[PDB]
Structure formats: structure tokens, C-alpha cells
Amino acid sequence: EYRNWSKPQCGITGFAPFSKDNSIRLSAGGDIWVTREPYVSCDPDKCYQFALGQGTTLNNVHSNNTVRDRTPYRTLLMNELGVPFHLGTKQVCIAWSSSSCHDGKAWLHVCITGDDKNATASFIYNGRLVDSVVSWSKDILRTQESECVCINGTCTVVMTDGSASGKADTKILFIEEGKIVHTSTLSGSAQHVEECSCYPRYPGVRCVCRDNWKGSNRPIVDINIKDHSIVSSYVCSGLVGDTPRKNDSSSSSHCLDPNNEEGGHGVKGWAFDDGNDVWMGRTINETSRLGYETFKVIEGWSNPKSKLQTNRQVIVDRGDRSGYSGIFSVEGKSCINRCFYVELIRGRKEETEVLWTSNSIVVFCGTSGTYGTGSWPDGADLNLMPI
Amino acid sequence: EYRNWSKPQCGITGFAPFSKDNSIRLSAGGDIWVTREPYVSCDPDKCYQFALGQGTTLNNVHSNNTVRDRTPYRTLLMNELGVPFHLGTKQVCIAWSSSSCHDGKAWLHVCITGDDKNATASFIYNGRLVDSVVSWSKDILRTQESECVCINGTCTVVMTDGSASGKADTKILFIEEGKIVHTSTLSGSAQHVEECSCYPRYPGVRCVCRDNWKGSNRPIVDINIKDHSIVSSYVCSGLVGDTPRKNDSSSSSHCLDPNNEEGGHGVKGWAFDDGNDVWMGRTINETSRLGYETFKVIEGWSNPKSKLQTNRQVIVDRGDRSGYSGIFSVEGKSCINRCFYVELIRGRKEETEVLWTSNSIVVFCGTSGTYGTGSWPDGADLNLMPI
Amino acid sequence: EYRNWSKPQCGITGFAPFSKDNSIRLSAGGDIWVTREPYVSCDPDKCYQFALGQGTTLNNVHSNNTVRDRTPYRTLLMNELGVPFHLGTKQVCIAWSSSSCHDGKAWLHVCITGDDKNATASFIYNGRLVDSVVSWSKDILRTQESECVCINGTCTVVMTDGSASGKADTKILFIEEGKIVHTSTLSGSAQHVEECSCYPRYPGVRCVCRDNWKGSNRPIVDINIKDHSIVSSYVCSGLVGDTPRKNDSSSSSHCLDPNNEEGGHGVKGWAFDDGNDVWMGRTINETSRLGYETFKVIEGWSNPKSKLQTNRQVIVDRGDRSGYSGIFSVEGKSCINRCFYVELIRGRKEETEVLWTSNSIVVFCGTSGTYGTGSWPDGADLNLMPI
Amino acid sequence: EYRNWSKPQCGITGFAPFSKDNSIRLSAGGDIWVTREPYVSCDPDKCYQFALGQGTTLNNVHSNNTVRDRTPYRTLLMNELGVPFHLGTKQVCIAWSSSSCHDGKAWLHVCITGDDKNATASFIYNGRLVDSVVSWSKDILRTQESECVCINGTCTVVMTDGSASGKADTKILFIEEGKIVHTSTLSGSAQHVEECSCYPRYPGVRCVCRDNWKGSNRPIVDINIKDHSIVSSYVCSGLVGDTPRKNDSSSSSHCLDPNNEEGGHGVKGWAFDDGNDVWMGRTINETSRLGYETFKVIEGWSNPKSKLQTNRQVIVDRGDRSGYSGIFSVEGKSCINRCFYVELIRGRKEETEVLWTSNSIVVFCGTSGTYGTGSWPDGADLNLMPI
Amino acid sequence: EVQLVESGGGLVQPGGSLRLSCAASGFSFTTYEMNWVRQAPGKGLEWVSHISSSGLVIYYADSVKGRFTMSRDTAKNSLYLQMDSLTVADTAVYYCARHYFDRDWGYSGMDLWGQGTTVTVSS
Amino acid sequence: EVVLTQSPGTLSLSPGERATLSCRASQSLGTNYLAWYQHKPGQSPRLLIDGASTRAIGIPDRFSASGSGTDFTLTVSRLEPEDFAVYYCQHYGNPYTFGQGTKLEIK
Ligand SMILES: *[C@@H]1O[C@H](CO)[C@@H](O[C@@H]2O[C@H](CO)[C@@H](O[C@@H]3O[C@H](CO[C@H]4O[C@H](CO)[C@@H](O)[C@H](O[C@H]5O[C@H](CO)[C@@H](O)[C@H](O)[C@@H]5O)[C@@H]4O)[C@@H](O)[C@H](O[C@H]4O[C@H](CO)[C@@H](O)[C@H](O)[C@@H]4O[C@H]4O[C@H](CO)[C@@H](O)[C@H](O)[C@@H]4O)[C@@H]3O)[C@H](O)[C@H]2NC(C)=O)[C@H](O)[C@H]1NC(C)=O
Ligand SMILES: *[C@@H]1O[C@H](CO)[C@@H](O[C@@H]2O[C@H](CO)[C@@H](O[C@@H]3O[C@H](CO[C@H]4O[C@H](CO)[C@@H](O)[C@H](O[C@H]5O[C@H](CO)[C@@H](O)[C@H](O)[C@@H]5O)[C@@H]4O)[C@@H](O)[C@H](O[C@H]4O[C@H](CO)[C@@H](O)[C@H](O)[C@@H]4O[C@H]4O[C@H](CO)[C@@H](O)[C@H](O)[C@@H]4O)[C@@H]3O)[C@H](O)[C@H]2NC(C)=O)[C@H](O)[C@H]1NC(C)=O
Ligand SMILES: *[C@@H]1O[C@H](CO)[C@@H](O[C@@H]2O[C@H](CO)[C@@H](O)[C@H](O)[C@H]2NC(C)=O)[C@H](O)[C@H]1NC(C)=O
Ligand SMILES: *[C@@H]1O[C@H](CO)[C@@H](O[C@@H]2O[C@H](CO)[C@@H](O)[C@H](O)[C@H]2NC(C)=O)[C@H](O)[C@H]1NC(C)=O
Ligand SMILES: *[C@@H]1O[C@H](CO)[C@@H](O[C@@H]2O[C@H](CO)[C@@H](O)[C@H](O)[C@H]2NC(C)=O)[C@H](O)[C@H]1NC(C)=O
Ligand SMILES: *[C@@H]1O[C@H](CO)[C@@H](O)[C@H](O)[C@H]1NC(C)=O
Ligand SMILES: [Ca+2]
Ligand SMILES: [Ca+2]
Ligand SMILES: [Ca+2]
Ligand SMILES: [Ca+2]
């Protein structure tokens, strides 16, 4: 009944299309929630799509200036993967920062809301509020914005509190049936850790996060469930995965320290290791959240300096908008599959023909078979959509 | 199978955010029921939100004059907690006054509708009408407007009939599987009892109600499920929870009698004891239903004359509208948790920019952990909403 | 597993309000199916509402001129009792005439569609088409427009073929798991039998039907489930239940023949026996479907020339619009309860300010307890509703 | 648990109406998906309806130019049979070419998307991506657009890659729990095979496809599940089932080769054998997809010269618009029943009154009983419908 | 949109035969009652004959009974009035009219009419 | 053997007065199967009132009718130049019968 993820990682030659939301296209006719920061988590039976709603639909007066990240009206929406966030969608908690877990028995939802400097993290397991914690750094308390990982009944969540540009306080919280049993301060060589994309790497949890302060390479947090030990590093891949970044010819990595190359900002992304190689996804645009590509770097997990690429896939075309991306793992018959989602942001602060900011999602799953090419953008024509 | 609520009460340092529906904000775009007098009741698996619908949606010609309390078209709406009252919502009975129970096996709904002077209470258990009773005082027959409590399959509901500003006939009904097995007239010190917020206090049931006649302190009803005995008193906290009331410096209370201080009106509220202390919620405004705060009063359950509060949380900011509030208990792994909802009334008779009256709901649950601050108002802008 | 209905009939002192959909009121804002000829039928767990849709919603161009009963687009809609017929409603079959059964294992739907001269009755059991039968009289083949009854897995349905005032052939079909195992022609003293309100009266089934040519008294069809023998008669009460009818002072019944009093038309209605007495419902208006009342006639099931009313209840005010009514039975803990629904028709051929015809329902269930008075009309104002 | 379809075929005298979604009529008021290429498949309990959505609703700015067959936004919608594709409908995968299977344990979805010359086929079983294959001919990779057949846990799907006007590479894929265990190149005398309507003919699978190259007679693919053997022929019946075709006087078939009679185009259709006879459905119009008829050809499965028709049923009237049609099988109590659906295409490239292309569906099921006549067209008035 | 178009009217010799045809455009003949109504020149409307949606001829005008045969063919959605032994009392403008029988409400008025066809019987 | 007798004949009014059109049945009809039609010259008859009380779809609000038993009335509240035509009352119950008609003239 408790998920252990003990099977080996699936042999992955690439990724195959799995799910598309079409939320913004459906918003032109029909009541669809205004969302951002989505992610995908699966119970043992099926997968669910989560998103932070803005307390409004798109064809709504309250859809105005929905570019704000933290409002009292933000809630975590939960549908089965493929069901668009319509008016029958269940909002499972109040949150402008969220992370969701299924441990094999019940769902665990980690929800942060409240004031910026006095945010409250609510731990909701099996439909009940079990635990709660306050901000420790009295700044914007934030979590993975993706699925957390449970092993043997113990779920782990990475929480950051403090400055977004500067040293912040990152904690790894071990939660058992909604109850916080242990809290570990982040240790290792990673300096800034936010919005971790975590996957089960038995007997532990591995997280690929974003450095928002000094690095375009992505930090790595390795969590041992057995003894609650934390170590930190970066991804050695010479092709860095954060946006903004330097171009492919001039980028670099150290995987012990941030590369100090256009690391002032970032975007949530993912990576996972295939032996010494790394599968990663990133925006095609090196400075903007435009397009999305996935590829494999030869010796990219164990060798800074590697820039050798293979198995490149265009998920979102270079001129089309992308956003946050994260990983989620699905247990197979004999192997654990790595899948990822791409958030397709449309709206304000980059497109000024509408007053709202919202997103659609596209989901890809790893495959050991063959696949072709394509591009799966949001596809909504904002020039014809209501404000 | 039957619920006994024999676990001890969870330790409470305060309350953490649990749920928010954003009903009015979603009503601007989308078909959302016009509701009032909501409450939350949970089966052993998940929680449900209830409300008294007005037979119409907000963007509807029939939403006009929805400030009326009793109409033939009012029905009890029942959704899972989090799912807003959209057009797919089930209305489980005809009721302009309602109370809902889960005994561990099936839902019990106590529904009152019909003429003000000749009203029927229908008792629906497991989807079937099992019993019914007529108004005994030939006045507005009304019930708790919150969740009722079943212990060992015996559910208790508090029903009042008679003058709202005078002596009224209150009866405690003992219902087994929808059938009225006993009916006890209210006895004790409380003179006026209405809209009781009842929670399981094993081996019995304790209810905190509103005195709409001559008290700003809240009456207490103690119900013994085995013996069927009823005893009445008042909340002894010097900080009274009813609106209207006097300010904290001037307000006084009594352990047995109404305080005769701005008691001619009232609002549905809640309170529960933690040893000699009382956890209570009330509106921040002393005369209007503006804002909502919760706090613990030291020796507030056993000592009148105690105005020493602590652990104060602002649920709704003082400038924002609140409404009815009630308690509901959720069984945990080892303890019983106390949770409360706040109805956020928006619309007519206090805001004349719209023709309708409706509400949103915010749900908080008790926590033994830590929490921050914040405010979670309704958030709709009625100046831009359809009239 | 197979429902047998061997429990006695519950003692009934009247009826208590059970359900109300507010369909027309919700149609003004929101997409609600255009329906007519509704009925209620319950599986052994919960009750379901059925209606014949017109292939359109109300706020639709296709809702124009929806007064006709037979179109190719009519389908049988099925929701849980309480859920309004929104766009998520399942249409379970094609039918402009329908009857639904639950035998304790699965749902049986009898659905008639096609040409007037050549109609097909499809029998869908457990979601599959199990049998079909063609018209025998090559006229409008029609069925109850209400729940049929199953005893020991054998469901009985009354089907009529022919003209409502010319020659009409009425057959009783015995269906087992969707298969027509026997077909018996109607035998007895009743001649025009249509839209039978059938209920289980162990060891048989008793139907109270509608006479469209000669009688304002309602025909009775008694079906022996074991021998498949049919007995026909009429209701003996001097207060007849059909509309049109004569005054209570000037009316008569024979209950072995039609009374030949204003019987050239009719409406679907119900009656069930309580010993020698009859519980019956009818419109308050003797000429039009205005208002609805229920009452018990003393010795009204056995003695004609009996006009002794008692326990009268106003379900719909005389000024408000009613329509088809029918009976459905709910098994209780120890007895069989009799409940009824009233269709509240609004729209064309009686209200010409709109172009559509649709209905809501109100459901009442028999009660052994006490009840008050009231009126539960449709409540929609058609002057402000979309035309 | 695994479905083996070992029962014989039910004796079929014709087909009775089963389901009708009224999608376009409900689109005029309400939010309904724009779809095309629908089909019906059933799990051992219920029948589900599938369609390829266009990523938009009908009353939407994005419904413009929905006549295109392959777009990145197309997804496979999956609802219960009867529930129209409303906004709560789940899209199970990204696909502009689809086929769905239930092997008795879980659903299999074969979904093709991506570039026209580099399409990807995803294989989704039990809500997981299990396998993936790339286009082998680098042309439009396509599949059955109907239900596929599983025997003993082994599902078989027919996939074609190549040109619509010449020789194409048709492959038969054997899938076990989402994993491709064998791939067989098409063998036999069928020259062009496309959009196969497959039904279980135990111990194997028989598929009736369309020839888009050189024949108006429908090709047959015979698949042996035990041996993975493929045999190809043509439906011998002289009354050819494809559109375009010749008139009933001049139509011919070779039973081994295409007839070279207006065979340059085609429509998806179905046929199944009843001994030496064939039950087939086709458009009434020879050149256009107008009207739909079903009949039985005496000795039509073996004699290439037989034109003896019987048991003709009109499903859609001659002047009304039909579309794709396909077969699906339902396990009864003692045999396997054959059912068929007809797509009712409305909109662009034939009806220029609207800017969108969409469809409705009507479902008929085989019956051993009697049935009448009728016609069940889409029934939407596009002159009044929103463009 | 629904329509009724009649044809086949023209000059006829007294004691002759004529077949009037009325075609339906939008609706279907299988669910509506259909009627023939004539207006003699200088007189009011006269109901000639009525056929049910089931194909039965309920009514014939007493004057035309035994001389006029009214039928229909739902395959071509056409209505026919076979007129035999025409007299001088049969020259009129002939209308095919449509009304509905409701299972619940019974008959309704004839709401759909055709353009009208002229029959002239002279010499 | 009902004989629908239309009391007013070749009635004349002005564009804006009230028209009172009467239809008397020889015997009690026994039902509401009474209909009113408008028959302008050179045009097909148009159903105005069905069921002796129900206005047809698309008929202007001016046309209203009432009555039962033997006497049925059709009233045009405010005449317009379009409303000048021949008006027929029809009994579409057994026995089928039309009225002789009543025409509105301009004054
Ligand atoms: C709160 O709600 C409750 C529950 O709903 C109400 O209690 C109910 O009250 C109604 C009042 O009508 C009781 O209805 C029963 O109906 C009969 C009278 O109905 C007359 O009207 C109907 C339709 O309008 C017609 O059929 C008849 O009217 C005419 O009929 C013919 C015409 O040709 C004439 O012959 C008649 O004269 C009329 O002109 C009906 O008469 C009646 O049969 C019935 O019984 C009472 O009256 C008879 C006659 O004397 C008595 O024999 C019988 O015993 C009843 O009278 C007493 O009954 C009990 C006995 O203790 C007590 O209630 C009283 O002592 C009472 O006098 C009766 O009236 C319905 O039964 C009842 N339901 C209950 C009690 O469960 C409350 O009124 C309501 N309260 C308020 C304040 O609104
Ligand atoms: C109520 O509903 C039921 C069920 O839906 C209807 O019964 C059905 O009626 C249809 C009428 O179409 C029956 O179809 C059968 O079709 C065969 C002939 O094909 C015809 O259809 C198509 C297009 O219309 C064309 O192919 C044919 O036209 C020509 O085709 C070729 C040219 O290439 C020629 O060679 C043909 O000869 C045609 O000229 C036709 O129009 C045929 O099987 C069948 O005809 C019957 O009668 C002929 C005598 O000429 C016999 O040879 C033949 O065996 C059939 O005999 C049956 O007749 C009745 C039917 O029960 C029985 O009494 C007999 O014992 C025997 O079974 C027929 O036309 C369809 O079979 C039938 N379905 C049933 C009964 O289940 C009812 O009509 C309907 N009632 C209404 C609307 O009032
Ligand atoms: C409680 O609420 C009332 C309003 O419901 C507040 O009263 C208003 O205060 C403003 C202050 O400028 C006055 O101008 C209004 O006349 C007051 N009444 C109303 C109805 O608007 C009141 O200040 C609030 N707070 C307290 C502590 O009483
Ligand atoms: C019930 O109906 C009868 C008619 O069947 C009414 O009695 C008649 O009333 C009318 C109107 O005054 C008279 O023209 C008849 O002469 C009366 N008698 C008959 C037998 O026709 C009776 O008044 C009605 N009762 C009520 C209370 O409405
Ligand atoms: C409701 O339906 C009627 C019937 O189709 C529509 O009215 C018809 O419109 C056509 C075209 O204008 C005319 O040829 C018919 O004579 C009309 N019928 C009648 C009796 O008026 C009507 O427009 C529809 N109403 C709406 C609002 O869509
Ligand atoms: C309450 O019911 C539960 C049901 O499992 C039972 O385990 C528990 O012991 C009960 N408590 C009491 C005091 O009856
Ligand atoms: Ca960075
Ligand atoms: Ca008070
Ligand atoms: Ca009658
Ligand atoms: Ca072809």
C-alpha cells in the first residue's frame, strides 16, 4: 500500500506525447480557471494535473492583473490529467505555493498561503489538515511547485524561505501521513535552491532545482530517506538548463559551485541521470521562456565540460511560449518511467493584448521505443480572445 | 461502522487555512449557485460543503431579491469541500433551514421548508425520507444551520420554534437512522437558543448557540447521548462572541444568564473549551458582521470576568464582510480536531451595487503546529460584477 | 440481489417535501436541458430523476417550438435525484416515450423512438440493448412515462399502441434481464389505458393509468407477477383524479367502467390504496393543469359514491402550473414507502411569452409523522427569461 | 479478467436505436467540444464514446478552420456513451488519429500525433505510456479511428503509413498491456487498407477497412491471434459499401481484388458476416456522405455476384449528412452482439453557413427482436447556429 | 426551413381524373398529420380530407367521399390527392396543410400551409 | 353535426380600432379544438389562434381569442393595415368543419 519506487529506472531513448490541456483555447468559449505553476502527480492508478488557481475564470472581470503570484484567493486545483480546470474542479487547499504527493495510500498536499513575511504551510493528508508550519525566515515561504516524492510511507518536501537573490534558508521536510517527523537544513555545495523537480532514485530522492542567485546550472539535492541525510551539488552538464543562460558555445558548469553565468534569475526545470548521462529539458530561447527542448548530454551528469548532445526533441517551437517545467515519475510493470510537463504561459508581462495571465500544459513521458518530431504549443490566438 | 468520536480532542495552538471556494469571484464568469447559511460536514473519508441555495445562479434574473431567508425554491446544496456550487451540484432536499449528519454509515439531512407558521422538517437518511415533524410553536421552525453530531448511530439536532425576540420552544431531537426516537425539550439556564454549533464532546454533544433575545454571550447546550439529559448555560468568557456586542473593555458575561448587553440580535458563531480555556471565533466589528478573528481566552470557559485572550488570528480583515460561522469536527489518527468555517456574505441589504445576496466560505482547521498571519476575504469586486 | 418488495406498505398520514430541481429558474443563467414527461426511479441505494429531453438546452435556438412530444432528437436523460439536467447529464437512450426500471441488479430502460406508424421499443438492461419490439397496432407506440416495477428479476411494463380515442391495444410486457419473456394483452373492464403509474403490491403490481376518451376516473391495471394474469378496473372514489373532470359535488365514479364525465382528455396521475381508502393526487383546477393537491378518500378504493376527503395537502398552489404526476416506491427499513413527483410544466401552449416548453419537478415522499403546509411551484418568471 | 470474446455471434435480424448525443444541437447553447472521427468502445460494464477533439468548443473563436485533419491541439476525448463532450470531458491523449481498446482489465489507447511526415504513435495502457513507435514510411501515420480488439490480453491494431492514392505500408501491431510484442506487415490480396472496423471473430480478429486507392469494395483483414497470421481479401458483396461508388445496378466486386469502380476516395465503414451473408452499412448517396442505410446481402460474404438485399434499415435520411461509421462488439449473456455508430458531420466544406466542422453520433445495436423504421439525423439548424 | 409545395393542378374535363401532389421540404411526413383544404372561388375554406402520421385517412368531406383518394409516400415525402369523376363543384384552390397530434395534448391547429394549387373544371 | 356560425360578416373598421370576431357553434364542441386562421387574398391561410385561447408562434400580440362551449371570440386590439383579411374559425375535432369566414374592411 505504501509506494517504495524500488523498480529500476526505465530505459529512455526519448519522450513521447502524453497529454495536452488546451486550457487557454477552451477559455475563449467556456468557463476555465485562470492558473499558473502547474504540475502533474499520479496515484497508483492514474495521473492528476495540479495548478495554482487565481480564484477566477478567464472570461471574468477578476481575471484582470492575474500576473500577481501571491493573493489570498489562490488555491490548488486538482483534476485528473486531461480534464481541463473547469468550474467543477476541486480546489483542495488555499495556496500560492504548493506540492502534492501520493504515498500509495492517500494524497498529501503541501499548501503555503498567507502574508509574504508570515506565510503558513498547511500539510493536508487524506483530506485532513494534519500539520502546519510558519515561515522561519519571515520571507516568501515557497515549495517545489511540483510533485514531492514519498518512499515507504515517508514523503519529502523541499522548502525555501528567504531572499530570492541572495542566501536563503532551504529545509527538507520529512512528512509521514501528513505529520512532519523531521526537518533537515539544506547541506552541501548548492547555494540557492528553489522549486525543486524531485524524482524517486531508490533508496533515495533526487531533486534538480533552480539557482535564482548566482547560477545558470541547476542545483542537485540528494535526499536519503533511510537516514535523512542531505548532500548538494550542481549539474555538470556544459549545456546548462536554466533560463536565462549563456549560449551553448560560451556556457559552462562546475557541479560543485554555480557557474556565475547569467544566474541572476531562473526558471523551474528538470533533469535526471541515465548512468553518466543526463536527460534535461530547457527553453530553446537562452534568455526568455520561449520554446522547449529536451536532449541527452553524454557524460553530462559526471563531467563538467561535456557539451555533446544527442536525442534532441523539440517539445515547444522556438517562437512559442513556454514556462515552468517539472518531472514526475510513473511506476511501470518492471521499471520506473520519467515523465515531464511543460507549462505554456500566455498573457501579461509578455503579451499585452490581454489583461490576464494564465497557462496551458503539455505532458510527455519517457519511452524506450521510437518517436518522431512535432511541436505542441498552447495554440490560443490571444488577438481574438476576450480580455 | 458507526462513529463514536471517542478519541481525545487534538491540541490546538490556533488554526491553519484549509479551504476556500471563491464562489462570488467565480460567479462573475460562470454559473454559480446563489447561496447563504453554509456549513461543513465530513464523512470519515472527505469533507463536504453545504449551503442553502436560492434556486438560482448569480448571473440570473432570479438572483434579484435573494436576501429573503425563506422561499419555496431554497434547497440544500451538497458538494465536496473545495468544489464550488456549479450547475452540477446536487440539491439533496427542499430546505430554507438545514442540518446535516454523517453517522459513519450514511448521511442524515434535516431539512425544514414550507410556510413560516406551518413548517415541515423532513429527515432524510441514506437518501430516503424516514421521518417528518411539523412546527410545534406555529412559528418559524429553524435548525442549527451547521453540522449535527451522531454518536453510536444516534444523531442529535437542535430545533427552535417561536419568537426570535422572546421565549421560544427549543427541542433536542434524537434521530436513529433518520427516525426520531426521542424529543427532549430544552432545559437549563439558557433562555434563548438558536443556530447551535455542535461538536462531539464524548460521551456527549456540546452545542454553542446564539442568544437572539437578550444576550451577547453564547448559550451552551450539553447533550448526553445515552441518558438524553439536557443542561443549558452560557459561555463564561468575558469576551463575548456574538454580534452585536459591547467592546472588550465594556462587555461583560455570566456563567448562567444572558448578560443583557446588546443581546437583542445575534449571529451564528462557535466556541469550544480546551480545559478551562475557550477557543472562540467572532466578528472583529462589535456591531456589524465585518471581519473575523479567532482567539483563546484563558479561563474563559470556567470564569466570567476573564478578558485575557491569546493566540489571536485574523481570519477576515476588519474591513471585509463576514457572516455565519460554525464548527465541525474531523477525526484524526489519534485525536479529534476542531475546524471552523466562516461565511463571507456579499450583496444586498449592505452593498447596494448588486441586486443579489450570496456568500463565499473560508475553512480553517485546528493545528498543533505553527502558523503565520494573513487575511482571506471574499475578494469579489461588486462594482464590476453583473447586477 | 433481485428486489422482491415483500415488505408491507408504510403507514402514511401524508407526504413530506423531498426534492426540487429548480430547472427553469436555473435555465435563465446556465445551460439546462429542455425536458418533459419526467419521473423518479430509485436503485436500492439512491433515487434518480429521468426526463425526455428535446435535444437542446433552454437558452438555445433549438428550444423554439419544443412542445411536440415526438421528435428524432428526444433522449432519456438520467441524473441523480437533485442534480439538474446540466450538460454533463447522461442521455441513456433514444426515446420520445420511456420507462425505467431497477430490478436490484441493474437498470432497465424501455425506450420508444422512430416513426409514428413504425415505432421501436428498445430494451436496454445493464447498459446493453437486450431486446427490441416493433409497434403491433402501427400507431403511436407509447409506455408509462414513469417507473416500471420488477419483482424477483421480472420487470413489468405497460405499453399502449393505437389511438387514445379510437381502437388502442394495451399490452403488459414481462421483461427478465432486458429480455421480453412474455407478452399479455390487456384484459378486464378498462379500455383506454395509458401512462400507468405502477407500484409494487406484493405478490403483484398495481397500476393507476390515464383514460383519454371516456373516463375522468382513473383506470386500474392489476398484474399478477406469478401467473401473468391481468385484471382491469377503475378507481372507486367519487373524487376522480383526472384532468379535465367535473366538480367534487357533481362528479361520479363507477370503478368497473368509465364515468363518461369530461373524459375526452386526461393527464398522467397516480393513486394507491390504503386498505379500503385511496391516496391520490390531482390538479386543483378541474379543467387545466393548475395546482396540485393530495388527499385520502375514506373507502375511496372500494365504495363509489364516496366523497369523504381527509388529510388534504397543497403541493402546488392553484394559481401555479402543474403537469404529469406519478408514483415511485422506495424500500424502507421495514416497509415500502410510496412517493410521488409532480412535473411543473412552463412554456408554450399555455404561456406565450416564451417559445419553449420545459418543466421542473417537485418530489414528495410518504411520511408516518407530521407535516405542515406550503406550496412549491416552479418559481421561474417567464417575463424576464430568454424567449 | 481478460476478455476472450469466446461466445458466438448473436442472431441479428437488424438493428435497434441505442444512443444519440445531440452534440451540435447542444452546441448552440452550452460549451461543447468540436470533434470529428468518433467511435464507440465498451468495457465489460459500460460503453464509452470517443472522438478526436479540435482543442476548442464550438462557440469559440478557435472553432474556425476546424476542417483540418491534423493539428497539434487535437486530443482524444473519452466520455460515457450518452454524455456529450462538455467541458468536463477527459482528453486521454494527444492524437489526430486514434484507436481505443479495453482488454477486460484496463483501457488501451493508441494515439498518433506530431508531424505529418514524422508522426509518433503513443500506446497508453492503464493510464500510462507503455510504448511508442515512429512513422515507418514518413507519411501520415494513421490507425483505425475505431475500437481495436483484444483477445486474451493481446490487442491488435491496424496502422497504415504511406499515400492515400497509391501503395501504402500497412502493419498489424500486436499489443499486450501497452507493449508492442509483435509487428506484422499486411499480407494478402488487399491492396490498400485504411481505417479498419475490427470486431472479434473468435479465435481471431476480422477487420473491414476502406480502400482509398482503387476499389469501392471494402478490404478485409483476417488476423489470427494465436498465430499472428494475416490474411487479406475484399468484401465479396456486389452491393459495395464504400463512398464514392457506382449505383446498385452497376456496382461490382471481385472478392479478391479492388473493383476499380470509383475507388479513388473512400469513407470509413463496417461489415460483418452472418454465415454466407454480410451485414453492412453505407451512405445512401453513392457520391456523397449523405444518408445512411444498413441491410443484409444474401450470400454476400461469399458470392461476388450476389446483389440480393434484405432487412434494409434507414439510419439517416437520404438528404441528411452522414460520415464515418464503424462497428463495436458487446458481450451479451450468451453471444457477442454487433453494434455500429454513424458520425453525423456538420459544417465546413459542405455547409458554408458556419466556419466550423464538427459532428454528432447516433448508435445502433444488433437485435434478434423486431424493430420499426425511422430517421435520426443530427438535426441542428446551422442557419441560426453561431458561426 | 419547412415548406409545402403543391403541383398537378390544371384544367380538367367534368367526369375526369386528376392527381394533386404536395411535397415537404424541411419536416418529415412520418410525425405530422396532413390535410387537403380547398377554397372554392367565391366560397370559404373546406376541409377535404385528413391523414394521420400513421397513414390512416381519418376524414373525407361528404361531397368528395368515394370520389377523392388521398394517400402519401413517406419515402419521397409527398402527399397525393387522387381525384376521380370531377364535377363543377370541385374547381377550387387546393391547399396541403400540416397539423400535429400530441400524445399528451391531442390535436393542434394546422400551422403549415402550402402555396396552393388551382383546379379548374369546365365544359 | 356542428355548424360553425361566424356572427359578424363583411365587417369594416379603421387602422387602430378593436375588432370583435365571433364564431358560434350549433352544439357544444366538447373540447378546445377551435382554431382561427387569417386568409389574405393571394396568400396561404395563416394560423393565428389554436385551442381557442393559444396564440400561434410568431403571431403579433394584438391577436387574442377566448371562449368555450358554443361561442368563441377573436379580438384584434389595435388594427393595422396588414390585419385586413378574411378570418376563419375551424373546429379540428370531430366533426371537422370550417366557418364561412368574416372579412375586415377599411373605413
Ligand atoms: C398545518 O398543516 C397541517 C398539515 O397539512 C394542516 O392540517 C390539515 O388541515 C386540512 C384542512 O383542510 C385537513 O384537510 C382535510 O380535508 C377535508 C376538508 O377539505 C375540504 O376541501 C376540499 C378541497 O378544498 C374539498 O374536497 C372539500 O370541500 C368541499 O367539499 C364538498 C363539496 O361538494 C362539500 O361537501 C364540503 O363541505 C366542502 O365544501 C373538503 O371538505 C376534510 O375531510 C378533513 O377532515 C376534517 O373535517 C371533517 C369534516 O368535519 C371531519 O370529519 C374530520 O374529522 C376533520 O375535522 C377534524 O379532524 C381532526 C380530528 O381531530 C382535527 O384536525 C380537527 O378536529 C378537525 O376539525 C380535513 O379538513 C387535513 O386533514 C389536515 N391534516 C392533518 C391534521 O394532518 C393544518 O390545518 C395546518 N395549520 C394551519 C394553521 O395552517
Ligand atoms: C416497419 O419496419 C420494418 C422493419 O424496419 C419494415 O420492414 C422492412 O421493410 C423493408 C422495406 O425496404 C425490407 O427491405 C427488404 O429489401 C429487399 C428489397 O430491397 C429493397 O430495398 C433497396 C432500396 O429500397 C433496393 O435494393 C431494392 O430495389 C431493387 O433492388 C434491386 C435492383 O438492383 C432489385 O433486384 C430488387 O428486386 C429491387 O427492385 C428494394 O427496394 C427485399 O429483401 C424485401 O422485399 C420483400 O418482398 C420481396 C417481394 O418482391 C421478396 O422477394 C423479399 O424476400 C421480401 O419479402 C419479405 O416481405 C415481407 C417482409 O416481412 C414478408 O411478408 C415476406 O415473407 C418476406 O420476408 C424488402 O423490401 C426489410 O426486409 C423489412 N424488414 C423486416 C421485415 O424485418 C416495414 O416495412 C416497416 N413498415 C412500415 C414502414 O409500414
Ligand atoms: C463597524 O462597521 C460599521 C459599518 O457597518 C462602521 O461604521 C461606519 O463607519 C464610517 C466611518 O467613516 C461611518 O462614516 C459610517 O457612517 C459608519 N456606518 C456605516 C453603516 O457605514 C464602524 O466604524 C465599524 N467599526 C466599529 C469598531 O464600529
Ligand atoms: C360544479 O359544476 C356544476 C355543473 O356541472 C355546477 O352546477 C351548475 O352551475 C352552472 C353555473 O351556474 C349552472 O348553469 C347549472 O345549471 C348548474 N347545474 C348543473 C347540474 O349544470 C356547480 O355549481 C359546480 N359547483 C361549484 C362549487 O363550482
Ligand atoms: C421560431 O420558429 C418559427 C418557425 O420556424 C420561426 O418563424 C418562422 O420564420 C420563417 C422565416 O421568417 C417564416 O417563413 C415562417 O412563417 C415563420 N413561422 C411563423 C408561424 O411565424 C421563428 O422565427 C422562430 N423564432 C425565433 C425567435 O427564432
Ligand atoms: C468507535 O468505532 C470504531 C470503529 O472501528 C472502533 O474501532 C472504536 O473502538 C469505537 N470506540 C468506542 C469507544 O466505541
Ligand atoms: Ca539562475
Ligand atoms: Ca444576541
Ligand atoms: Ca380522461
Ligand atoms: Ca475507395
Automatic annotation (TrEMBL), chains A, B, C, D:
N-glycosylated. Residues 9-387 are annotated as: Head of neuraminidase. Inhibited by the neuraminidase inhibitors zanamivir (Relenza) and oseltamivir (Tamiflu). These drugs interfere with the release of progeny virus from infected cells and are effective against all influenza strains. Resistance to neuraminidase inhibitors is quite rare. One of its GO terms (molecular function) is metal ion binding. It is an enzyme of class 3 (hydrolase). It is found in: Host membrane; Virion membrane; Host apical cell membrane. Its cofactor is Ca(2+). The active site is at residues 69, 324. Disulfide bonds join 10-335, 42-47, 101-148, 150-155, 196-209, 198-207. Signal peptide: none annotated. Its EC number is 3.2.1.18. It catalyses: Hydrolysis of alpha-(2->3)-, alpha-(2->6)-, alpha-(2->8)- glycosidic linkages of terminal sialic acid residues in oligosaccharides, glycoproteins, glycolipids, colominic acid and synthetic substrates. It is a single-pass type II membrane protein. One of its GO terms (biological process) is carbohydrate metabolic process. Ca(2+) binds at residues 211, 215, 242. Substrate binds at residues 36, 70, 194-195, 210, 289. It comes from the Viruses. GO terms for cellular component: host cell plasma membrane; membrane; virion membrane. Homotetramer. Intact N-terminus is essential for virion morphogenesis. Possess two apical sorting signals, one in the ectodomain, which is likely to be a glycan, and the other in the transmembrane domain. The transmembrane domain also plays a role in lipid raft association. Catalyzes the removal of terminal sialic acid residues from viral and cellular glycoconjugates. Cleaves off the terminal sialic acids on the glycosylated HA during virus budding to facilitate virus release. Additionally helps virus spread through the circulation by further removing sialic acids from the cell surface. These cleavages prevent self-aggregation and ensure the efficient spread of the progeny virus from cell to cell. Otherwise, infection would be limited to one round of replication. This is Neuraminidase. The chain holds residues 83 to 469 of 469 of the full protein.
